[PDB]
Amino acid sequence: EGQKDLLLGELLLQKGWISREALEEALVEQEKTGDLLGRILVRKGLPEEALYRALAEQKGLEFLESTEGIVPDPSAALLLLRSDALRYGAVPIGFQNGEVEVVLSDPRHKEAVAQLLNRPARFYLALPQAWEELFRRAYPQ
Amino acid sequence: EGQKDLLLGELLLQKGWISREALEEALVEQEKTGDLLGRILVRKGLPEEALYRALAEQKGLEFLESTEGIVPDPSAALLLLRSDALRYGAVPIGFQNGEVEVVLSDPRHKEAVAQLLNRPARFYLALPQAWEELFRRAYPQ
Ligand SMILES: Nc1nc2c(ncn2[C@@H]2O[C@@H]3COP(=O)(O)O[C@H]4[C@@H](O)[C@H](n5cnc6c(=O)[nH]c(N)nc65)O[C@@H]4COP(=O)(O)O[C@H]3[C@H]2O)c(=O)[nH]1
Ligand SMILES: Nc1nc2c(ncn2[C@@H]2O[C@@H]3COP(=O)(O)O[C@H]4[C@@H](O)[C@H](n5cnc6c(=O)[nH]c(N)nc65)O[C@@H]4COP(=O)(O)O[C@H]3[C@H]2O)c(=O)[nH]1
C-alpha cells in the first residue's frame, strides 16, 4: 500500500504513461496556469481512465470501469440526502460486510465523505459520465 | 483515417507513450529474437493498455475499457460457432444499424474475422481478461 505515499506525477512515471520531460513540462505549465496536473496530462495525451486508476491507487479507492450493472440499494441511498450526494459527489449503492459501498466522482473528496458518513465504508471511483448515470439511478427525480 | 498507415512504434511515439530510446532498444532486441514488438515493449514497461489503445487506432477498432456492461445478444452469438469465436478470438455481441458488433481479443485477426463474417461489422478491442469474461458470458460451455 506504498502507492498512497506517491505524488500523481510519480505514479504515472512509474507506470510509464508519461516521460520525465513531459511531467516537468506539465508542472512548469501548472506553475503559470493553476490547473490540476491530471487535467494537463490528459490534454497532452494521457487517457482519462489511466488518470483515474492512478488517483484511485493514490487514495485507496477501487476504480470502476463501468457502472452499468449496479442496481442501487434504496436502503443505502437513505444514508445521504440527495443534495449531499450531489454536493460531495458520492453515491451510496449498497452494503458489503457491514460497510456501505460509496461511489465517488472525485478522489479528493474521499476524506470529507468518510468523516461525514461516520461508519465503515468502501469507496469506489467512477469517471464523470458513469458517475452521473449511477447518481440519477440512485437518486431519481 | 491516416492512423491506419502508421507502424506501432510510430503511433506510440506520436502519442507520447514511448521514448525513442526505448523503441530503438526493443527493435534491436527483436532483430535478435523475433518476438512481437508490443510484447517486448510491455515487458520493458509500456502499459498493456497503451499497447492496445495504439493497436486499436492502427486497425480502426474501438478500444473497450471494460466488457462488464455488455449484455451479449444470443442471436448475434449464433453468427459464429463457439469453436470459431474462440479460435479467432471474436465475440459477436449485438447489432447496430445493420452491422454486427464484434469484440476482438487481437487486432491482427480483424481481417480474418471480417472475411469470414462476410457482412457489415463494427469491431471492438478488449484486453485479455475483459475479453475472456465476455466470451464466457456469450458462449457458456
Ligand atoms: N479529480 C482530479 N484530482 C487530481 C487531478 N490531479 C491531481 N489530483 C489530485 O489533486 C491533488 C492536487 O493536485 P495538483 O493541484 O496538480 O498539485 C500537485 C501538483 O502541483 C504536484 N505534483 C503532482 N505530482 C508531482 C510529481 O510527480 N513531482 C513533483 N515535483 N510535483 C507533483 O504536487 C501537488 C500535489 O500532488 P498529489 O499528491 O498527487 O495531489 C493531487 C492529486 O491527488 C485531476 O486531474 N483530477
Ligand atoms: N496483438 C498484438 N499485435 C502486435 C503486437 N506488436 C505488433 N502487433 C502488430 O503485429 C504486427 C507485426 O508486429 P511485428 O512482428 O513486431 O513487426 C513490426 C515490427 O518488426 C516493426 N515495427 C513496428 N513499429 C516500428 C517502428 O516504429 N519503427 C521501425 N523501424 N519498425 C517498427 O515493423 C513491423 C510491422 O509492424 P506493424 O505495422 O505496426 O504491425 C504489427 C502490429 O500491427 C503485440 O504485442 N500484440
Author numbering:
A (entry chain B), B (entry chain A): 161 to 301
Kindly provide excerpts from the paper associated with this entry:
The traffic ATPase PilF from Thermus thermophilus is important for type IV pilus biogenesis, twitching motility, surface attachment, and natural DNA-uptake and contains three consecutive homologous GPSII domains. The N-terminal part of PilF harbors a remarkable arrangement of three successive general secretory pathway II (GSPII) domains (GSPII-A to GSPII-C) with high sequence similarity to each other. Interestingly, we find that PilF binds only two molecules of c-di-GMP with different affinities and that the c-di-GMP–binding activities can be attributed to the GSPII-B and GSPII-C domains.
To further test if in general a hydrophobic interaction is indeed beneficial to high affinity c-di-GMP binding or if this effect is lysine specific, we created the K167L PilF159-302 variant and characterized its c-di-GMP–binding affinity. The L167 leucine side chain is well resolved and in a similar conformation in both chains of the asymmetric unit and involved in an extensive hydrophobic stacking interaction with the c-di-GMP guanine base. Moreover, a large hydrophobic residue at the very first position of the c-di-GMP–binding motif is apparently thermodynamically and dynamically beneficial for very high affinity c-di-GMP binding.
